[PDB]
Design a protein around this ligand. Sequence first.
Ligand SMILES: *[C@@H]1O[C@H](CO)[C@@H](O[C@@H]2O[C@H](CO)[C@@H](O[C@@H]3O[C@H](CO[C@H]4O[C@H](CO[C@H]5O[C@H](CO)[C@@H](O)[C@H](O)[C@@H]5O[C@H]5O[C@H](CO)[C@@H](O)[C@H](O)[C@@H]5O)[C@@H](O)[C@H](O[C@H]5O[C@H](CO)[C@@H](O)[C@H](O)[C@@H]5O[C@H]5O[C@H](CO)[C@@H](O)[C@H](O)[C@@H]5O)[C@@H]4O)[C@@H](O)[C@H](O[C@H]4O[C@H](CO)[C@@H](O)[C@H](O)[C@@H]4O[C@H]4O[C@H](CO)[C@@H](O)[C@H](O)[C@@H]4O)[C@@H]3O)[C@H](O)[C@H]2NC(C)=O)[C@H](O)[C@H]1NC(C)=O
Ligand SMILES: *[C@@H]1O[C@H](CO)[C@@H](O[C@@H]2O[C@H](CO)[C@@H](O[C@@H]3O[C@H](CO[C@H]4O[C@H](CO[C@H]5O[C@H](CO)[C@@H](O)[C@H](O)[C@@H]5O)[C@@H](O)[C@H](O)[C@@H]4O)[C@@H](O)[C@H](O[C@H]4O[C@H](CO)[C@@H](O)[C@H](O)[C@@H]4O[C@H]4O[C@H](CO)[C@@H](O)[C@H](O)[C@@H]4O)[C@@H]3O)[C@H](O)[C@H]2NC(C)=O)[C@H](O)[C@H]1NC(C)=O
Ligand SMILES: *[C@@H]1O[C@H](CO)[C@@H](O[C@@H]2O[C@H](CO)[C@@H](O[C@@H]3O[C@H](CO)[C@@H](O)[C@H](O)[C@@H]3O)[C@H](O)[C@H]2NC(C)=O)[C@H](O)[C@H]1NC(C)=O
Ligand SMILES: *[C@@H]1O[C@H](CO)[C@@H](O[C@@H]2O[C@H](CO)[C@@H](O)[C@H](O)[C@H]2NC(C)=O)[C@H](O)[C@H]1NC(C)=O
Ligand SMILES: *[C@@H]1O[C@H](CO)[C@@H](O[C@@H]2O[C@H](CO)[C@@H](O)[C@H](O)[C@H]2NC(C)=O)[C@H](O)[C@H]1NC(C)=O
Ligand SMILES: *[C@@H]1O[C@H](CO)[C@@H](O[C@@H]2O[C@H](CO)[C@@H](O)[C@H](O)[C@H]2NC(C)=O)[C@H](O)[C@H]1NC(C)=O
Ligand SMILES: *[C@@H]1O[C@H](CO)[C@@H](O[C@@H]2O[C@H](CO)[C@@H](O)[C@H](O)[C@H]2NC(C)=O)[C@H](O)[C@H]1NC(C)=O
Ligand SMILES: *[C@@H]1O[C@H](CO)[C@@H](O)[C@H](O)[C@H]1NC(C)=O
Ligand SMILES: *[C@@H]1O[C@H](CO)[C@@H](O)[C@H](O)[C@H]1NC(C)=O
Ligand SMILES: *[C@@H]1O[C@H](CO)[C@@H](O)[C@H](O)[C@H]1NC(C)=O
Lengths: 752, 222
Amino acid sequence: LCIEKERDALLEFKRGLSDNFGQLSTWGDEEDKKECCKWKGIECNKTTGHVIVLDLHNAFTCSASACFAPRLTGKLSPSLLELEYLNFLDLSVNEFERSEIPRFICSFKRLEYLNLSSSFFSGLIPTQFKNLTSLRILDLGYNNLIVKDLTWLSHLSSLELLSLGGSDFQVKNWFQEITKLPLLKELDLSLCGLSKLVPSPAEIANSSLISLSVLHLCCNEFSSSAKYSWLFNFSTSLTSIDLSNNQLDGQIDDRFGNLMYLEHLNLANELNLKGGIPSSFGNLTRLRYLDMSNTRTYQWLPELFVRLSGSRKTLEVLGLNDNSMFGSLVDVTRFSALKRLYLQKNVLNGFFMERFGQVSSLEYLDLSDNQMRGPLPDLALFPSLRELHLGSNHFNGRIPQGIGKLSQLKILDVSSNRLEGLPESMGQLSNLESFDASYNVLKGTITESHLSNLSSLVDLDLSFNSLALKTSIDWLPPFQLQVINLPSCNLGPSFPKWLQSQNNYTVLDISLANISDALPSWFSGLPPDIKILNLSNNQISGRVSDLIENAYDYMVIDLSSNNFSGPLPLVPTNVQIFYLHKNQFFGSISSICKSTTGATSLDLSHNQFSGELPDCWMNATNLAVLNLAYNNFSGKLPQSLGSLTNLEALYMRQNSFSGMLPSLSQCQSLQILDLGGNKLTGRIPAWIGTDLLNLRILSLRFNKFYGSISPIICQLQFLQILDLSANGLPMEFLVQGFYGKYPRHYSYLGNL
Amino acid sequence: GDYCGQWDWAKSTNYIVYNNLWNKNAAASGSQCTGVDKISGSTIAWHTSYTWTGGAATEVKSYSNAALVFSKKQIKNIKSIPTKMKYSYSHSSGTFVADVSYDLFTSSTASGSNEYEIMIWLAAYGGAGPISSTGKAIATVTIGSNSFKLYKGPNGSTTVFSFVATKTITNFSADLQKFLSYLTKNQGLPSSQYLITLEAGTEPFVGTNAKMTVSSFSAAVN
Ligand SMILES: *[C@@H]1O[C@H](CO)[C@@H](O[C@@H]2O[C@H](CO)[C@@H](O[C@@H]3O[C@H](CO[C@H]4O[C@H](CO[C@H]5O[C@H](CO)[C@@H](O)[C@H](O)[C@@H]5O[C@H]5O[C@H](CO)[C@@H](O)[C@H](O)[C@@H]5O)[C@@H](O)[C@H](O[C@H]5O[C@H](CO)[C@@H](O)[C@H](O)[C@@H]5O[C@H]5O[C@H](CO)[C@@H](O)[C@H](O)[C@@H]5O)[C@@H]4O)[C@@H](O)[C@H](O[C@H]4O[C@H](CO)[C@@H](O)[C@H](O)[C@@H]4O[C@H]4O[C@H](CO)[C@@H](O)[C@H](O)[C@@H]4O)[C@@H]3O)[C@H](O)[C@H]2NC(C)=O)[C@H](O)[C@H]1NC(C)=O
Ligand SMILES: *[C@@H]1O[C@H](CO)[C@@H](O[C@@H]2O[C@H](CO)[C@@H](O[C@@H]3O[C@H](CO[C@H]4O[C@H](CO[C@H]5O[C@H](CO)[C@@H](O)[C@H](O)[C@@H]5O)[C@@H](O)[C@H](O)[C@@H]4O)[C@@H](O)[C@H](O[C@H]4O[C@H](CO)[C@@H](O)[C@H](O)[C@@H]4O[C@H]4O[C@H](CO)[C@@H](O)[C@H](O)[C@@H]4O)[C@@H]3O)[C@H](O)[C@H]2NC(C)=O)[C@H](O)[C@H]1NC(C)=O
Ligand SMILES: *[C@@H]1O[C@H](CO)[C@@H](O[C@@H]2O[C@H](CO)[C@@H](O[C@@H]3O[C@H](CO)[C@@H](O)[C@H](O)[C@@H]3O)[C@H](O)[C@H]2NC(C)=O)[C@H](O)[C@H]1NC(C)=O
Ligand SMILES: *[C@@H]1O[C@H](CO)[C@@H](O[C@@H]2O[C@H](CO)[C@@H](O)[C@H](O)[C@H]2NC(C)=O)[C@H](O)[C@H]1NC(C)=O
Ligand SMILES: *[C@@H]1O[C@H](CO)[C@@H](O[C@@H]2O[C@H](CO)[C@@H](O)[C@H](O)[C@H]2NC(C)=O)[C@H](O)[C@H]1NC(C)=O
Ligand SMILES: *[C@@H]1O[C@H](CO)[C@@H](O[C@@H]2O[C@H](CO)[C@@H](O)[C@H](O)[C@H]2NC(C)=O)[C@H](O)[C@H]1NC(C)=O
Ligand SMILES: *[C@@H]1O[C@H](CO)[C@@H](O[C@@H]2O[C@H](CO)[C@@H](O)[C@H](O)[C@H]2NC(C)=O)[C@H](O)[C@H]1NC(C)=O
Ligand SMILES: *[C@@H]1O[C@H](CO)[C@@H](O)[C@H](O)[C@H]1NC(C)=O
Ligand SMILES: *[C@@H]1O[C@H](CO)[C@@H](O)[C@H](O)[C@H]1NC(C)=O
Ligand SMILES: *[C@@H]1O[C@H](CO)[C@@H](O)[C@H](O)[C@H]1NC(C)=O
């Protein structure tokens, strides 16, 4: 069906642009690419072969704090005039030469859809746009163009949609010039500086009274009903109004309720919509989407539901999140088409009751970071939930045995509530990806039926609860979980057997469980990319020298408070905090820093360690918390300690250290330095008062320091504790990759 | 001296220049090696260099940053957050995607989880752009001879405000208190938030044989 001149043209057009990522790879003069209409972004008329559709529009994907777009970064070539009959040209979200809109585009005379939005087209519209009389829909939004004369518009009578958002809009009288269009259903003027340009009552009188249906006015600095009052002249026939991000400080005009067909209203991210929706909202009848997020509307919730009762049956999405809305949540089931309701981060202090005797169709519900109390309702009434957010409240009771009826449920967050137990019926969810019921007051034993039939689980979080989790001995779980936080839960007297079967996890927190056997032999084949292993505070045994694997890019290893034994496991290469305290290790620590390590905090205290400290601490410069206290250590303090450019706390109490104290001049920043019971001798040196200006605790008790005291120690003046007996003379560190981009800050100062 | 470790750093008096390849394993088959050149009182000088190619090119790979440690002070009680920056940047071949940005954060408590994030991008290349829930700017602001477009979007719990320079700036200087206070008056950041971290570096998405040179990075909280 393909026409020759058109491929030739399309190919020369491609020759200018640099696709770089593809998109235009399927374009060529090749025999294999010989029908141009089966190419990406071209569609041809079925009978006449002339191309009718060209869209190189590109969306963009957002990851983390950044979002990315494959922009075309090319030159836009006039050979396209040869296409002759295209009703659709879309070059959205592409960067060309960030230049004038090319005038040849106006020389088409058969266009109906021109979308150049969200590119970088700059300068100002060519007046030649008045020649494009055939244009039904124009989008030129979110470019860098200035708009001072709107004269051409009068000629495009055919328009039914015009976006001029994101302009240097400086036109005194758009009202006249925009009412000149007989069929404009939709207008976008967002970020056009509309507030500076206010339609006069007079200019509104000399106007065409168009039947306008959808309006976008976001990003205009209105702040009062005045600069947007012109809107209500289309009261006859409106459906959407987007007045989001307007610094709106005032009560909403009761006019909105009066509009008969309003079905979509976004007033989100305002300054102060004092109160909230008025009583005229009871007259709205059909409505579908309301958004007063981040408006500080202080309104009683069920009176809002009264004032939306005009639309029990039409309202689909209600977004009242991050506001000061008080009250209780009663009979949300009455809203039969409500699918999304977002009430998080309000001031609600009441019960989640629902007694209507009807069933809701809520798929997404968020009542987090409130003050709510009372028990949950029978969730069997809310079967369509895909994600149920309820954290940071004060709910109580057990979780209802009807939660087992939530099949489409993927996410459940009931953290930081005072709930008291789990039903077996949530061994039926099978789509529950992430289940977090941490910091509650749950009591009881969780059997394998509790977690039966839940194949799609990847996050389990039951932290700091009064709970127990014992499976049957020969139970095989249907789930492999990347995140496993089960602190303060007794998982079995025996090391939980079910973890032999999990091989995809990357963060293991089994701490404060009651466990007492030796480390099983199978557990050595622990997944190769674990970043957080917290086995501490148990009675686990085995010599972990050969029972842990090394350099797996650890991030947090805490093996403290156990009955582990042996010599120190050789420290993995990329770990940052490595805690071995409160165990039965012994031997040299001559292996610590033979290999380079970036650990920022290691704690080796309360062991049976011995020997002379190796002189390799420049192979671990990154330490800021060193804790060797409460071990039997004999030897000179290694001069390598001078190599700790940042060290915040140095714990050396209760060793048998002898000799003089080594040069610590270069470790200018430190806050804690105790060497108690260390049997160390020499004069108290000058650099404690001289280079170590930073300092808060200094303990040199029960040593052998000969010589007099320098008075210069009075020049620190932030030192809070000084103890130098029996001699004869707000702090923390960071783990960097913890939360992805964001570091984590850990506190280590404790008993003062 | 330049150093290639994933979470390596280098405390330097007033400023700490962290290198974070916090996203190295993005299947991006490459390496990055950062490093400090000069110290001169309030002004520092540093560089990095990298070659991240392929895998996930939708993603950031690293944020080598120049950071301030300061008396964490409430937004209300900052008179001036003066800063300046001068750099030039060198790359080769094709598919160079990356940005150059400041990154500030705020929380309720002096030691709290990041609640607000303020990015101020001096440069956007190859299609790199800030997280935006809309794809479109909430507003355009002008500060100290620079024109900025503001985007806002969610990074999990953090609310990320991002200013993008219309002029890709190779010589920035300004008072970031004007930016912080603009947000407090107009978009809705509480003045009670505590300013936590000030960082300035680059986020690369793809690139080959790249090297940034920072002639100076003076910065303060007074
Ligand atoms: C000229 O060219 C221009 C340049 O392209 C054209 O401009 C484009 O027009 C398109 C329309 O033609 C636009 O496409 C539509 O986008 C909307 C955007 O809203 C949604 O996404 C926003 C960002 O989140 C998504 O984005 C990224 C990238 O994909 C993802 O990383 C995210 O994960 C997320 O993806 C989610 O969405 C899918 C969709 O189902 C899910 O299934 C996924 O699992 C993901 O979770 C965001 O703004 C919206 O979210 C709001 O609410 C969220 C929670 O609900 C909250 O997190 C957000 O922060 C935001 O919250 C705000 O509101 C809440 C209340 O809701 C408040 O509480 C809060 O305070 C905030 O105020 C939303 O997620 C999108 O909805 C559309 O999707 C429909 O249509 C497309 C096809 O067109 C399908 O692909 C969709 O699946 C869906 O299709 C059917 O399904 C719908 C029901 O699910 C149904 O209702 C539909 O009608 C349909 O039947 C489109 O994706 C495009 O954005 C726009 N681009 C630009 C740059 O302008 C221009 O049109 C053109 N000119 C012309 C044509 O004249
Ligand atoms: C490997 O695992 C082990 C064990 O899992 C880790 O070691 C543990 O780490 C835990 C986390 O740090 C830590 O728990 C925190 O302890 C802090 C200090 O506790 C003080 O307050 C409690 C009050 O508890 C009492 O009430 C509760 C509730 O009924 C009871 O359950 C208790 O039994 C008590 O009756 C006192 O008892 C203590 O004596 C101290 O005075 C707590 O502050 C902290 O709680 C904070 O976070 C909670 C998160 O949900 C939150 O609920 C709580 O309100 C606290 O809120 C904090 O954050 C907010 C916001 O900034 C702030 O305003 C608050 O002021 C507060 O800072 C935790 O409870 C364990 O104690 C600790 N165990 C050991 C042996 O050390 C180990 O760290 C880990 N390995 C690594 C490397 O991390
Ligand atoms: C919700 O809608 C009702 C009905 O539209 C509103 O009440 C009605 O308001 C109209 C105003 O135009 C009244 O109609 C006219 O009133 C004048 C006197 O003002 C009268 O002379 C005319 O003959 C005509 O009736 C109408 O009487 C009134 N009440 C009805 C219809 O029962 C109401 O104001 C809206 N609610 C809110 C909160 O605004
Ligand atoms: C595709 O091309 C055909 C003809 O090449 C178009 O058909 C004409 O359609 C109009 C209105 O439907 C009629 O008045 C003409 O009589 C038709 N002509 C012929 C020869 O059939 C058709 O509309 C085109 N469609 C598109 C989408 O381009
Ligand atoms: C816009 O439309 C008018 C109307 O057709 C065009 O003006 C014509 O220009 C040609 C050029 O030689 C003349 O022969 C006609 O007599 C003109 N007609 C009228 C009514 O003035 C104008 O050229 C068009 N602009 C573009 C860029 O095509
Ligand atoms: C094992 O865990 C990894 C992640 O640590 C899973 O990998 C990703 O899973 C998400 C889930 O939707 C996908 O979107 C990604 O495409 C996956 N990426 C990679 C590189 O695999 C992985 O699927 C898990 N495997 C099993 C069998 O559970
Ligand atoms: C600091 O770490 C380096 C490794 O980065 C150690 O160097 C290795 O030493 C062994 C024998 O001791 C040699 O066989 C290797 O060839 C060396 N490797 C490298 C890369 O140099 C070094 O010994 C450590 N320093 C101290 C004082 O322990
Ligand atoms: C326009 O709106 C004002 C106030 O809303 C009203 O007084 C005026 O008569 C309206 N004109 C038309 C034609 O609707
Ligand atoms: C899971 O539950 C469903 C519903 O009763 C049932 O069809 C299925 O066989 C169950 N599977 C197992 C392994 O119990
Ligand atoms: C262990 O320390 C004690 C003092 O705390 C000391 O008496 C004993 O000799 C030490 N063990 C040695 C030196 O082997």
